[PDB]
């Protein structure tokens, strides 16, 4: 009945690869809870190594504030388990990332969407300042899909449990997300919640843009000195100037001047109440949303055999 379900290795399994990054590598898999007789399907995140690493109790000491979450828009973690690697377990999401639906759908998605996203972004965002847990890797590829009208961020925090804060990380080779992170924290190693204002900013980027790539063909060693001579990322086709400007304004270098996440719920608000005054898409009038399970990523999940006879972690929980 732990908030932090401790799992042994015997009690989940690792069925297929889904990717690597830089905090570790993601796997499908089902989750089979010792004494009773159910299969949950769940994502699976083992994590990278270190040559100092930090004592069990430190992990489980911060992966417990990982699986307290508790809001509509903020994944939560339900399990992990120690070895010789940390592998962190969590409720499978089968529409998979929001990044990936934006390039899938562009032609698709109107203005009411997109907006609706900024806002369940900016609640997840100011629930997480709420528990003064800064996420330090924030990103479209760290949004999910629940429904095509609900997000929910994950992998927050683990930037803080890898040590990324201090020197050692990056001395043993460990790489951070430089094109979505603020000056301050590329220069400094300081993360704050407005450090994770200006990923937000880029998150919405990345959005607005159905997905490109943020200073692509740019090598990240050149960005620290790009930032410092005021360059930014350029306004996309479909955002009036207005919107552009909230991204704008969550780029400054100080970081005490960018929106607040309370600030950027109100304001995103206001504009999903009149979209198409904010956004700039042809056809927005006449775009339907396919159907969530007709998409590819759910069926390339679920229709597997292996995914036998399962019970969704909603449902279970
Ligand atoms: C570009 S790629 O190909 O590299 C993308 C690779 N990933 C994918 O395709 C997908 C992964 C995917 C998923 N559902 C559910 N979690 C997922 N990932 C994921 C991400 C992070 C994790 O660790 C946490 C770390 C800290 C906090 C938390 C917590 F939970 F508290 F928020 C979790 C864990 Cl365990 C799983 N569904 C499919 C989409």
Known sequence: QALLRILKETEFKKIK??????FGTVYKGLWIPEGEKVK???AI?????????KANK????????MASVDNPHV????GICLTSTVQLITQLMPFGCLLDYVREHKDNIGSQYLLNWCVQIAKG????????????????????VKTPQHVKITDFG???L?????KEYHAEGGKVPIKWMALESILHRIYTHQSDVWSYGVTVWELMTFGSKPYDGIPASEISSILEKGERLPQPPICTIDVYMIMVKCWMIDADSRPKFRELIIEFSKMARDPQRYLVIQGDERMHLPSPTDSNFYRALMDEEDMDDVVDADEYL
Do not use: F, Q, W
């Open 17 to 22: 690869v889904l990717g690597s990054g830089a």
């Open 40 to 42: 949950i399907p769940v």
């Open 45 to 53: 995140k083992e994590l990278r190594e270190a040559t100092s690493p």
């Open 58 to 65: 430190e992990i489980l000491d911060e992966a417990y504030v």
């Open 75 to 78: 994944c939560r973690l339900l």
């Open 125 to 144: 965002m100011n629930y997480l300042e709420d528990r003064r847990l800064v996420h330090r890797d924030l990103a479209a590829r760290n949004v999910l």
């Open 158 to 160: 683990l930037a803080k």
């Open 162 to 166: 890898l040590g990324a804060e201090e």
